[PDB]
RNA sequence: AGCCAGGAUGUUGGCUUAGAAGCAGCCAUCAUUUAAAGAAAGCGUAAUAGCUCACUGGUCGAGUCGGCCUGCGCGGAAGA
């Protein structure tokens, strides 16, 4: 698998789009954008529903390719 | 180098070493854990 | 020259902090003690230097065997980068085509006019190597002043009819203000750069930059501090105009009915705040007048009457910077000043709720006398943004206080509201309410009402065992990446209140509250935690608690 | 000593201001008033006519 | 004991919604995948990431480890 490049425990509530002041270094601190996460965010948890405390992985490569596999509300 | 008349181990890389009679204690991490005799 | 020197260090850490597409045309000769020299990259030769120092001769030379190798790379790189934004020269590197040398010298002067790559050459000046092949660059790559486009502008009108600042000898008179300095033995001297038009010296010009119309007196020539006079103001040079008041600095002039190509460019911040105290108010007129003079010819530098202390502040950009302003003032200017501190913004408030304080104020002895008797019910209030900052509601219902006293006790009241006799500073969140009293006929005048209820604001006041509050000001700053934590324990450890961080496109910037009175001197010190790439911007927020150490502190 | 004429002021310690005499007729000791709009005040705050005075300048209108 | 190994999922588990995510504490102090692993002993963090350890596989080839009771010693321990 993807050893320490990017991985963080993260995502409490998948029911918010642009987490700038809340995440921000969350995930930030290594070497992902904010504006581009809550887009990759639309791209597939907006199909589950929107509103919901949704846990989700967060994968991240060094090719700058970040994406994300969800799962269900903890 | 504290000179505490009564020497105790502060943390795993602290040890007590008898050189001279002297009680030392030598740590391989936290030189502030590096005291004498006591 | 100096040890660990490296050329290719630089020529890479350009890239990886500044990503400037680094085109070496020169490469050294030698290290500490072997630099002998620099190769040539537009000719592929090399240049040898005379005796250590002194650059006496150039001795035109070829390539050292012991560089021969990596010259003829970075060479084939340096023409690899002759043609990368032009698709002609691209198929002559594309059929590897033999460049013209003085031609490919222009290609890339096209590029460094558009902007993206710049010439990178060594040499070390003390050694006097390296430095006229940097100066034979300065022309055969640098622009001129008709090599860069007429500036686009304003006129004076609406759509202000956007032009270009032409340096043709036949466009109307322009030119900016850039410098503006007052000469000891001659006078103010101001600097200017001509950018359109001509002129002799003499000529009513029309500053539309503020609609201001003015002369010019002689035209000189700054050489460094000699004065060269000049008759005709040819366009596109630079020089010194004197006899001017109306004309401050970053200004354009022009007289021939051509408005202002006019931008504006100075917008720095004051971060730095002190307090200066002259001896001898006598001396402090003239440091009015002193200031007045210095601070309006250089631009960031600003000065504040403040509001609430009345202390002359002194606004500067950096540490240094207020060091010398001052230092200017004794020397120069005559002005003995010993630098204070900021004073503070405290606020008393209440903390508790009395319920029955009263206030008589009875003095008969005969004659004409006073009476009043009032009581209220100070509360505290929500230190809302409400403007009532104290908040009053009349609660007479049987009718014992004449409608003619109300303005008076409240005024009472209100002209204690501003004393603060915890500490004398002003009051703020009050909850104050009037529930009864008790009027005594004639001998009762509006005066007696505003000290009563004042002294009666007291008691309760006293029964309220009353509070400060410092303001806090809200702060905002920038770094990098590393330096994060750093930051923050710093301000944790000013007694601030941390409220939010983020990370952006390289900077992490932080969101926290902190009280004011310790950010005396803050930025000086982020910027030495932060290898000075760091710096914030900080503004009022709120009061908010005192602490208690300091509140006994505080006490004069 | 000098009366700050007109409405309220700005003025406090240090403000180097134009003086020129009229006693007040009522507050004793006072010989002087204070040209309002000079060299360090302001002149008055919406003064519509009589406004050479009070260094209020000419109304926009 | 050293030498090669590992040391997991829900799980960021609430709240004081800044945030204390195995590592500030309160609360619980679970159940599963289980050669073993505590929802944690310590270093590392604004809050994370990070580094090891308990426990457990093998190797290896024999004793090893923690308290109690006392004998006699060392340190504590510098003056004209």
Redesign the pocket.
């Given at each position: 698998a993807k050893k320490?490049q990017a991985?963080?425990?993260?995502?409490?509530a998948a029911g918010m789009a642009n987490p700038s002041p809340?995440v921000?270094?969350?995930l930030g601190?290594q070497g992902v954008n904010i504006m581009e996460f809550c887009k990759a965010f639309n791209a597939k948890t907006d199909s589950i529903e929107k509103g919901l405390?949704?846990?989700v992985?967060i994968t991240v490569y060094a090719d700058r390719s970040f994406t994300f596999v969800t799962?269900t509300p903890? | 180098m504290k000179v505490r008349?009564?020497v105790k181990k502060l943390?795993?890389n602290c040890k007590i070493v008898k050189r001279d009679?002297?009680?030392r204690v030598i740590c391989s991490?936290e030189p502030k854990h590096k005291q004498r005799?006591? | 020259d100096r040890m660990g020197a490296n050329f290719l260090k630089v020529v890479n850490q350009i890239k990886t902090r500044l990503g400037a597409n680094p085109v070496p045309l020169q490469l050294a000769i030698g290290a500490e003690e072997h630099f002998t020299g620099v190769v040539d990259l537009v000719k592929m030769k090399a240049i040898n230097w005379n005796d250590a120092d002194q650059g006496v001769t150039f001795e035109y030379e070829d390539i050292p065997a012991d560089m021969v190798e990596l010259a003829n790379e970075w060479h084939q790189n340096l023409i690899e980068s002759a043609a990368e934004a032009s698709e002609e020269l691209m198929e002559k590197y594309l059929g590897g085509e033999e460049l013209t040398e003085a031609e490919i010298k222009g290609a890339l002067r096209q590029r460094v006019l558009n902007n993206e790559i710049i010439l990178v050459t060594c040499g070390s000046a003390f050694k006097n190597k390296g430095v006229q092949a940097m100066l034979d660059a300065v022309i055969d790559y640098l622009p001129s002043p008709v090599d860069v486009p007429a500036i686009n502008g304003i006129l004076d009108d609406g759509k202000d009819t956007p032009a270009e600042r032409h340096a043709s000898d036949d466009e109307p008179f322009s030119a900016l203000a850039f410098k503006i300095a007052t000469d000891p033995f001659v006078g103010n001297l101001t600097f200017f750069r001509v950018y359109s038009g001509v002129v002799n010296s003499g000529d009513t010009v029309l500053n539309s930059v503020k609609a201001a119309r003015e002369r010019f007196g002689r035209i000189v020539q700054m050489h460094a501090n000699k004065r060269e006079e000049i008759k005709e103001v040819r366009a596109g040079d630079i020089a010194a105009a004197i006899g001017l008041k109306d004309v401050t600095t970053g200004d354009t002039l022009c007289d021939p009915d051509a408005p202002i190509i006019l931008e504006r460019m100075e917008f720095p911040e004051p971060v730095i705040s002190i307090a200066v105290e002259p001896k001898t108010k006598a001396d402090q007129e003239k440091m009015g007048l002193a200031l007045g003079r210095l601070a309006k010819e250089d631009p960031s530098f600003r000065v504040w009457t403040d509001e609430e202390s009345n202390q002359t502040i002194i606004a500067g950009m950096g540490e240094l910077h207020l060091d010398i302003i001052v230092d200017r003032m004794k020397r120069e200017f005559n002005v003995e000043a010993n630098v204070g501190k900021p004073q503070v913004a405290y606020r008393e408030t209440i903390r508790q709720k009395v319920t029955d304080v009263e206030g008589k104020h009875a003095k008969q002895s005969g004659g004409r006398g006073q009476y009043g008797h009032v009581v209220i019910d100070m509360y505290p209030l929500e230190p809302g943004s409400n403007p009532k900052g104290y908040e009053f509601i009349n609660d007479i219902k049987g009718g014992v206080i004449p409608g003619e006293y109300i303005p008076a006790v409240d005024k009472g009241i209100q002209e204690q509201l501003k004393a603060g006799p915890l500490a004398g500073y002003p009051v703020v969140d009050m909850g104050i309410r009037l529930h009864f009293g008790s009027y005594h006929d004639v001998d009762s005048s509006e005066l007696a009402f505003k000290l009563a209820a004042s002294i009666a604001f007291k008691e309760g006041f006293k029964k309220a065992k009353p509070v400060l509050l410092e303001p806090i000001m809200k702060v905002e700053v920038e770094t990098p990446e590393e330096n994060?934590?750093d930051v923050?324990?710093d301000l944790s450890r000013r007694r601030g209140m941390?409220?939010?961080?983020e990370s952006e496109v390289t900077g992490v910037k932080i969101h926290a509250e902190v009280p004011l009175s310790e950010m005396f001197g803050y930025a000086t010190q982020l910027r030495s935690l932060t290898k000075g790439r760091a710096s914030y911007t900080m503004e009022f927020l709120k009061y908010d608690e005192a602490p208690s150490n300091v509140a006994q502190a505080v006490i004069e | 000593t000098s009366y700050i004429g007109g409405e309220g002021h700005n003025l406090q310690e240090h403000s180097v201001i134009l003086i020129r005499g009229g006693r007040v007729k009522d507050l004793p000791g006072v010989r002087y008033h204070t040209v309002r709009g000079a060299l360090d005040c302001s002149g008055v705050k919406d003064r519509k006519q009589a406004r050479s005075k009070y260094g209020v300048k000419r109304p926009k209108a």
């Amino acid at each position: 698998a993807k050893k320490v490049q990017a991985y963080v425990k993260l995502q409490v509530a998948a029911g918010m789009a642009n987490p700038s002041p809340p995440v921000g270094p969350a995930l930030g601190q290594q070497g992902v954008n904010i504006m581009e996460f809550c887009k990759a965010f639309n791209a597939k948890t907006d199909s589950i529903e929107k509103g919901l405390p949704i846990p989700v992985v967060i994968t991240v490569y060094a090719d700058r390719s970040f994406t994300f596999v969800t799962k269900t509300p903890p | 180098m504290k000179v505490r008349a009564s020497v105790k181990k502060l943390c795993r890389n602290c040890k007590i070493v008898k050189r001279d009679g002297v009680i030392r204690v030598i740590c391989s991490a936290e030189p502030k854990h590096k005291q004498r005799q006591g | 020259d100096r040890m660990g020197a490296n050329f290719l260090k630089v020529v890479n850490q350009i890239k990886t902090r500044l990503g400037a597409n680094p085109v070496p045309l020169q490469l050294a000769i030698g290290a500490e003690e072997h630099f002998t020299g620099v190769v040539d990259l537009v000719k592929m030769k090399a240049i040898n230097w005379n005796d250590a120092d002194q650059g006496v001769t150039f001795e035109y030379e070829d390539i050292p065997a012991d560089m021969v190798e990596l010259a003829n790379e970075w060479h084939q790189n340096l023409i690899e980068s002759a043609a990368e934004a032009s698709e002609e020269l691209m198929e002559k590197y594309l059929g590897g085509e033999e460049l013209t040398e003085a031609e490919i010298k222009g290609a890339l002067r096209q590029r460094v006019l558009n902007n993206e790559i710049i010439l990178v050459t060594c040499g070390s000046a003390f050694k006097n190597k390296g430095v006229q092949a940097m100066l034979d660059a300065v022309i055969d790559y640098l622009p001129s002043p008709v090599d860069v486009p007429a500036i686009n502008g304003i006129l004076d009108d609406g759509k202000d009819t956007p032009a270009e600042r032409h340096a043709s000898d036949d466009e109307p008179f322009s030119a900016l203000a850039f410098k503006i300095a007052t000469d000891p033995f001659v006078g103010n001297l101001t600097f200017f750069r001509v950018y359109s038009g001509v002129v002799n010296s003499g000529d009513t010009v029309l500053n539309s930059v503020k609609a201001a119309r003015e002369r010019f007196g002689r035209i000189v020539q700054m050489h460094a501090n000699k004065r060269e006079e000049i008759k005709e103001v040819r366009a596109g040079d630079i020089a010194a105009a004197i006899g001017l008041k109306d004309v401050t600095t970053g200004d354009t002039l022009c007289d021939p009915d051509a408005p202002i190509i006019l931008e504006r460019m100075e917008f720095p911040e004051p971060v730095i705040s002190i307090a200066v105290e002259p001896k001898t108010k006598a001396d402090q007129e003239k440091m009015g007048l002193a200031l007045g003079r210095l601070a309006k010819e250089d631009p960031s530098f600003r000065v504040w009457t403040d509001e609430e202390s009345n202390q002359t502040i002194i606004a500067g950009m950096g540490e240094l910077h207020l060091d010398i302003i001052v230092d200017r003032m004794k020397r120069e200017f005559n002005v003995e000043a010993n630098v204070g501190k900021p004073q503070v913004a405290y606020r008393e408030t209440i903390r508790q709720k009395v319920t029955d304080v009263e206030g008589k104020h009875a003095k008969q002895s005969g004659g004409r006398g006073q009476y009043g008797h009032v009581v209220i019910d100070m509360y505290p209030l929500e230190p809302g943004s409400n403007p009532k900052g104290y908040e009053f509601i009349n609660d007479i219902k049987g009718g014992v206080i004449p409608g003619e006293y109300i303005p008076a006790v409240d005024k009472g009241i209100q002209e204690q509201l501003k004393a603060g006799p915890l500490a004398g500073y002003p009051v703020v969140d009050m909850g104050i309410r009037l529930h009864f009293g008790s009027y005594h006929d004639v001998d009762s005048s509006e005066l007696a009402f505003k000290l009563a209820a004042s002294i009666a604001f007291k008691e309760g006041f006293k029964k309220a065992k009353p509070v400060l509050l410092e303001p806090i000001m809200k702060v905002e700053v920038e770094t990098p990446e590393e330096n994060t934590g750093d930051v923050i324990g710093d301000l944790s450890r000013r007694r601030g209140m941390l409220k939010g961080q983020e990370s952006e496109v390289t900077g992490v910037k932080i969101h926290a509250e902190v009280p004011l009175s310790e950010m005396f001197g803050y930025a000086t010190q982020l910027r030495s935690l932060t290898k000075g790439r760091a710096s914030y911007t900080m503004e009022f927020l709120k009061y908010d608690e005192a602490p208690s150490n300091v509140a006994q502190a505080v006490i004069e | 000593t000098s009366y700050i004429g007109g409405e309220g002021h700005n003025l406090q310690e240090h403000s180097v201001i134009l003086i020129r005499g009229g006693r007040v007729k009522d507050l004793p000791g006072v010989r002087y008033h204070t040209v309002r709009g000079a060299l360090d005040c302001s002149g008055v705050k919406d003064r519509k006519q009589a406004r050479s005075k009070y260094g209020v300048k000419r109304p926009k209108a």
